[PDB]
Design an enzyme around this catalytic site. Structure first.
Site, mmCIF file in Angstrom:
data_model
loop_
_atom_site.group_PDB
_atom_site.id
_atom_site.type_symbol
_atom_site.label_atom_id
_atom_site.label_comp_id
_atom_site.label_asym_id
_atom_site.label_seq_id
_atom_site.Cartn_x
_atom_site.Cartn_y
_atom_site.Cartn_z
ATOM 1 C CG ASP A 173 31.285 93.267 18.841
ATOM 2 O OD1 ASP A 173 30.203 93.053 18.219
ATOM 3 O OD2 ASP A 173 31.462 94.220 19.631
ATOM 4 C CB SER A 188 37.541 95.979 18.255
ATOM 5 O OG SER A 188 37.669 97.403 18.196
ATOM 6 C CG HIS A 218 33.677 95.685 22.094
ATOM 7 N ND1 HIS A 218 33.312 95.429 20.791
ATOM 8 C CD2 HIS A 218 34.907 96.248 22.042
ATOM 9 C CE1 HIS A 218 34.277 95.829 19.985
ATOM 10 N NE2 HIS A 218 35.256 96.332 20.719
#
Ligand code: CL
Ligand code: CL
Ligand code: CL
Ligand code: CL
Ligand code: CL
Ligand code: CL
Ligand code: CL
Ligand code: CL
Ligand code: CL
Ligand code: CL
Ligand code: CL
Ligand code: CL
Ligand code: CL
Ligand code: CL
Ligand code: CL
Ligand code: CL
Ligand code: CL
Ligand code: CL
Ligand code: CL
Ligand code: CL
Ligand code: CL
Ligand code: CL
Ligand code: CL
Ligand code: CL
Ligand code: HG
Ligand code: HG
Ligand code: HG
Lengths: 297, 297, 297, 297
Positions: C163, C135, C227
């Protein structure tokens, strides 16, 4: 000629945190770390090789690792290479085999002696001990099972005979061979029919055909490989639960796909947890891990 | 007496989508799907067994699979069990071995004949062909490599010799054994010193000690195993790149952990992508997959 | 409000023989065993968490372990919980996200400083350093990649972005987000499209769909799960090589079973050893270990 | 407003040979294979999710699978997502949670109705049925337990409560929450103290501390994770017997290695076979499979 003696028999003790491939004798046994305690908590499994072999071969060491890597397993590999005639294959095989054959009862007493100590000096309950033997090591295991009973210790929880040697035992009475009564549960893996025997010998007899193992070669040329497949089979079953599933021995055995835990059995440490008893047919693959199904039961 | 004949030699042809373990001959070959095309695009690899063995044993089929599963590999396992005396082991080993050994150039010429076909009728480039051979199979492969050069096809890209038979070949001239000039690259794996030979034979000689393999048991009692270990070690190197790293042969070999691609080599299909040449020491473990280091170079 | 500061950034150094889940700072770092030596010989991997998270969380600790277990890995998990707003989720999420997003170049500088130190004071070659970030931690790792260049250290061998956060980055120029140029090899795992982004960001972009991961729930309710599925996927790929195989991104992607090493790539530490570059499609299974093929390539 | 209705409740029926992830209703249930028989011999287990969740989430299916893989288990997963407010999460949590809590008795009644059928029309004895519920699902399960006793069916053999929801139940009378009298044995797993409750609710209460689960993150930020951990911890106990061993709750809990089946209990399907009752402290690891000892007792 290929003699027996307690000072000549040795062990290799393996635990998760003790992979020292060192050899101990009944003396040096107490020097082992796991044996420095006053109480031994692990499940104990003895592994005994047969004719002209030794505890430090690939197949038996792999088995020791697959157990030791489960967590609470103390593995004792029994090495009797001398009395097994391993230290001298110089000719006359049939005479040698007959010597090692008769040494089986002595190595069995040896195992029972070590067992008495685990029980009385380390507080290891008999329910916590199992014997694993291949070919002649299978009869060794049962003679040990008979001896502990004689020693007033009770029966071993389980004795696993990996393709029990056939010549010199096939038609012996229960008192002179591995026998369904030597432990509370006696699990027999049958793989070869010349070096091994189709004769029924335990609470449950798994008939991985049981001869001419697939991928081993031609019927007799591959006899030694079919003989050894018993050790490799049991190891895969320790590793992968239900790798090999057996179906009630039939002339038209059902497929493993149709199995339920009430009439089939997963070969391995927990075979006894399944209720069905007797002979089972067990189809197998030609290369590792040989497993005959992905489901569990 | 343990006779040779073209029509007696068989082949098993495997590709990712043709696991048919069927046997073909120089006649039934054109009937294989992969051979119905006018140009074979796969990397072609011949696998050849040695004395008293056969193509469809576990070890070799496992090698044929580790190769085919990669994708663009057509695997040709050469079966000559009769010329290799497989089908008749009836006593006198030393006489039999001599006939099988003699038959090596014949099977070699046979392989070269199949190569000339891959080259001329299927457009396969020699750069796309490799031979792998165990014990007598290794010399068979060398003869094949010599043969193709005589046939005017040039050299095979590579010939891998797994523990090349020593008795009857160790002190031969380069023309009568597998030799470092039989291919652009000749990779030799040494694992036993009585059935195999310690003598240098190729571009690179990997000495996985190279005798008394670990986990194979006692010195001579475990010779047959040590000798077979070369087929298994290579297979594992096919499956896991750098499973086995070799360090320049030293009386005091440096650890594999200190290796760089500049002085060490990963035994395998891509050993030739490494510049170091010569003799290497290759430490090994006692149980499949035997690998000597997690690192890759 | 959710502030950045060098002393508030902490690290956890895990090596095979040092699982002390202790936190060190640019100060207390030299006190760690591995850093008592003059030279560090292990492969180094940083792991950086994202918005409102922290180093000692399950998934990141699982990945730290899967690495260390593979012998020569020294794992440093970067913990920037306060700069990531972890320490105060009191309402206005969109504001907090912006705060953490700005702090990303700062945590990046920090990692670069630590890199300067591994290189200059421990002779750790850049070729031996990898950054993994999730992230906001991916962008952080990219900024780290920029800083080191700017520092004249050359490039990291590889930056792996699990991700990469989409909001506030997706349409930034290469200088303001993780970018294909940040290291020699940049591996991007795409798993969600609202929290992550479909935009291409690396040498290789694996699109494990890439949104609505299987078993995560409904499209938007399971966003948070899809996610996080990026971190869990990478870990399984470190564990099981080729657990996830990517095929060339296509409107009608061929199946994984048809793969060869020339057009497909095994997601993971070794992805760069695979020649094909670009976007790939990666189908996945709905439960751990999510792997999409048993074959290796 | 996040309404309840029997029509709206659906089930997923799983047996070793019936992984069809299809939903059935009181109407379509009879169309299931396992339900075409006149009797169901399997051991039956219901698994009910809680607030804003669903039957087909990853954790629950993994649990279903871990049971069915045990041979004689028909797993019925109760999906009531609408009455649990899963299909509308739009704003005011405290109000929604208020409605889902209210619907728990309704869903319990549903479960009890399915049970009465299993009992009366499929001859499944209560001794063979277990209920497993998480957060609100735990109380729903307990309501079903009350209902069956009201229906003159006797008690469920066991009800397993995974981190029972605390708010709106913590201080209720035994009649309005999961309670130790709801089945012959009631096993409670405590993992979070804000979403869950430390109050004792069963025959045995396992305190996996029981709050701030290790590896879940900061104290309140990882509350949701800590809360879901109870589902995962239990799944591993079904998989690995004695994965998590409980010790008598004490301000100074003894370690798990000193345990014996006399004073400690293995959390799981067979906890009731352990003599000790009441509150247990359960130390845990930070990553799957969390297990706290390798020994079995
Ligand atoms: Cl186990
Ligand atoms: Cl295995
Ligand atoms: Cl194995
Ligand atoms: Cl495996
Ligand atoms: Cl495994
Ligand atoms: Cl494993
Ligand atoms: Cl397994
Ligand atoms: Cl399993
Ligand atoms: Cl397993
Ligand atoms: Cl495997
Ligand atoms: Cl591998
Ligand atoms: Cl294995
Ligand atoms: Cl392997
Ligand atoms: Cl393997
Ligand atoms: Cl693997
Ligand atoms: Cl692996
Ligand atoms: Cl594996
Ligand atoms: Cl698992
Ligand atoms: Cl895994
Ligand atoms: Cl299990
Ligand atoms: Cl198990
Ligand atoms: Cl177990
Ligand atoms: Cl597990
Ligand atoms: Cl596992
Ligand atoms: Hg087990
Ligand atoms: Hg693996
Ligand atoms: Hg298990």
């Amino acid at each position: 000629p290929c003699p027996y003696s307690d000072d000549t028999v040795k062990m290799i003790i393996l635990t998760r945190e003790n992979k020292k491939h060192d050899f101990y004798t009944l003396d040096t046994i107490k020097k082992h770390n796991e044996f420095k305690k006053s109480t031994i908590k692990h499940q104990v499994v003895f592994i005994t090789h047969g004719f002209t072999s030794s505890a430090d071969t690939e197949n038996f060491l792999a088995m020791a690792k697959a157990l030791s890597d489960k967590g609470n397993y103390l593995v004792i590999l029994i090495d009797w290479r001398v009395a097994a005639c391993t230290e001298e294959m110089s000719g006359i095989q049939l005479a040698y085999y007959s010597y090692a054959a008769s040494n089986t009862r002595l190595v069995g007493n040896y195992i029972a002696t070590v067992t008495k100590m685990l029980v009385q000096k380390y507080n290891v309950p008999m329910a916590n001990i199992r014997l694993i033997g291949h070919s002649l090591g299978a009869h060794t295991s049962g003679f040990a099972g008979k001896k502990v009973q004689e020693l007033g210790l009770g029966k071993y929880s389980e004795i696993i005979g990996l393709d029990p040697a056939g010549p010199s035992f096939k038609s012996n009475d229960c008192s002179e061979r591995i026998c369904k009564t030597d432990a509370h549960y006696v699990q027999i893996i049958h793989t070869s029919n010349h070096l091994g025997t189709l004769v029924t010998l335990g609470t449950v007899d798994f008939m991985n055909n049981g001869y001419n193992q697939p991928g081993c070669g031609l019927p007799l040329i591959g006899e030694t490989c079919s003989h050894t497949r018993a050790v490799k089979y049991f190891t895969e079953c320790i590793k992968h639960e239900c790798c090999l599933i057996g179906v009630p021995q039939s002339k038209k055995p059902q497929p493993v796909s149709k199995c339920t835990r009430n009439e089939c059995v997963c070969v391995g440490l927990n075979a006894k947890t399944y209720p069905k008893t007797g002979s089972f047919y067990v189809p197998v693959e030609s290369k590792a891990p040989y497993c005959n199904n992905k489901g569990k039961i």
